[PDB]
Amino acid sequence: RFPEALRLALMLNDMELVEDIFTSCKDVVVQKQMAFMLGRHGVFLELSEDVEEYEDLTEIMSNVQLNSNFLALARELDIMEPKVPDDIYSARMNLASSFVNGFVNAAFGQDKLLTDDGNKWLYKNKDHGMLSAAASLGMILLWDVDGGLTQIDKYLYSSEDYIKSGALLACGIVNSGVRNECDPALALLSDFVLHNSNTMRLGSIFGLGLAYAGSNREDVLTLLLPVMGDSKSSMEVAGVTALACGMIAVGSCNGDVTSTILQTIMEKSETELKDTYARWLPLGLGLNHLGKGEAIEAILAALEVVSEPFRSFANTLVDVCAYAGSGNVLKVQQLLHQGVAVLGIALIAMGEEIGAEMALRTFGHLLRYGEPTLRRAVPLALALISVSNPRLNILDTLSKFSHDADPEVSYNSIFAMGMVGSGTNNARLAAMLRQLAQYHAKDPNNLFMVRLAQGLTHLGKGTLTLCPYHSDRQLMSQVAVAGLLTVLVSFLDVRNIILGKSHYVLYGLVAAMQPRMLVTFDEELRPLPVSVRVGQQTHTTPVLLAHGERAELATEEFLPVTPILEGFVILRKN
Amino acid sequence: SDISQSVSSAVQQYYSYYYPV
Amino acid sequence: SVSSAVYSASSYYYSSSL
Amino acid sequence: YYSIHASIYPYYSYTSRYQSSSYGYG
Amino acid sequence: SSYSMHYIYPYSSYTYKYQWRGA
């Protein structure tokens, strides 16, 4: 009974076990099922070309067919029509609309703004807002590598540097989660990582980080690591480079990135480590050690030389990253600088439900009576612990604290409502956002957060999720966690990172985007309609599961190869 | 907010320190 | 060049297009 | 460490007596 | 206005094709 073993092994996070059990099998269709599981988990394992069905197992692992099945389900629902931003309802509102359009139309390669000629929209934006506008094209064309690049290529030759940087970022985005074997992204992006213009460096490096977040490629890391030591690199470029390297090397314990990050910290003046882009350096370090637990002491000891104010931040962030999956009661006691502390409480507690409910009570207490500075991060922790999970109590709390006189609590509460409801058409939440949009009219920043939350609620027109867990809520996608942490750590300085120049980091959410649709196949990977009983009623598949539902097929005619009816399942005959 | 609405057994209401008493 | 095409070796300068 | 009621909270340096500082039991 | 000739790209007017591939 092979399929269970590979689940348990993937939980153990051990490469050797994964490859040991993914072979040592006398069936092929079971290997195809395990390949679908690995593809969902974002693990790609290299196989010898002499294995019995190398071509198809490789084709499955690289999610090449994901786009076609997703568009097939989009044809079943009859939802291919584009939704302009005004249907959901200054430069800052053009940018807000661009983001709404990108979120809503994600994974359908259609749009009414970025038409055949997108200059008409791009030149209504300016500077970084125009960069993120150009970057949104790659979010609309997600997982469509061939058509994505065919559409993006026109902007790669623009005279405007912001548009070219956004096209580079789009080219990176369209390569996320697909791992095609021709390497279009390394060939297209790698010439700009040391470009003279820093905006080009930011776009190329973030694109490469998103395109290769799955695997710790040695060539991409050797390309990128020099850029943190370049004397022309801004602190923003060094931070983005550390983010990219930690995403690419996430959970790998790669020593050369670790040493490079420590060297880049040790070089920086006590005056520069005050720059808030410096917070991305230990974030990349934690991503490099995410979930490795007690092994982190060696680096905690190496960090002892760092300046005292920065030391608290680096140590806390790296420690809570190392234990992100642990669900350790004692580290939670230690955490019970402060913002990263509460984010680490959520990051650790999300691994089990009793700890998560105690965390929810703690976060409510902190929002009501906590330190005035400490409560600023609490809504982001509430977002992290309950992404794509529209709990009524959480949404009520955030709606209460959505008017708070302290602007950052309001901003973070609104963003947390948008995240919690992401990928769900919840009508209560949509009405809340519409009312808060009427209240926060004539308030550009709160209105911007409201528009972001509105767009995020309708992400994919209801067909996408951001939850990091999958397969019966028992396996954690490290790339999803890395993207979510990138965004929320950037939101611990929302007024200067997100509302400033660097809102392009919101596109890190693409690393966590996944489909929430069930699909059944015959042993030939051919769409096989069956009837299912989705509980916690009947429908004709492919059907959409919500956060906590279990789907069962209501006849004994077919038997599934995997015990878990999540994602893609191959079905045998009697 | 203004406060109607809900108070989690905080009853005068003293829902939080950042709301009018 | 780590950024070129020879199509695609198994089926040009991308930046310059020379 | 207490608070006096406009309201003033010295232990939080916040400006906008409660029986309990943690939960403000009236 | 969707392809480039061999170099000229007439949309951007960039001067110095199999869609986005080098061939």
Numbering used by the authors:
A (entry chain A): 261 to 349, 367 to 613, 649 to 848, 866 to 903
B (entry chain C): 1 to 3, 27 to 34, 90 to 99
C (entry chain E): 29 to 34, 50 to 54, 92 to 98
D (entry chain D): 34 to 38, 52 to 62, 101 to 110
E (entry chain F): 33 to 38, 53 to 62, 102 to 108
Paper text:
PSMD2 serves as a docking site for a number of substrate remodeling factors on the 19S regulatory particle and interacts with the ring of ATPases that unfold substrates for entry into the proteolytic chamber of the 20S core particle. Here, we use mRNA display to rapidly identify peptidic macrocycles that bind PSMD2, an essential component of the 26S proteasome. Determining the structure of PSMD2 at high resolution either alone or within the 26S proteasome has proven challenging due to the relatively small size of this subunit, the preferential orientation of the PSMD2 particles in ice and its intrinsic flexibility within the 26S proteasome. Here, we describe a new strategy of targeted protein degradation through direct substrate recruitment to the 26S proteasome.
We assessed the structural impact of MC1 binding on PSMD2 conformation by solving a PSMD2–Fab apo structure. Comparison between the PSMD2–MC1 complex and PSMD2 apo revealed that association with MC1 does not alter PSMD2 structure, indicating that this binding pocket is preformed and not induced by ligand binding. Moreover, this site is accessible in the 26S proteasome and situated adjacent to the AAA+ unfoldase, suggesting that it could serve as an effective location to tether substrates for targeted degradation.
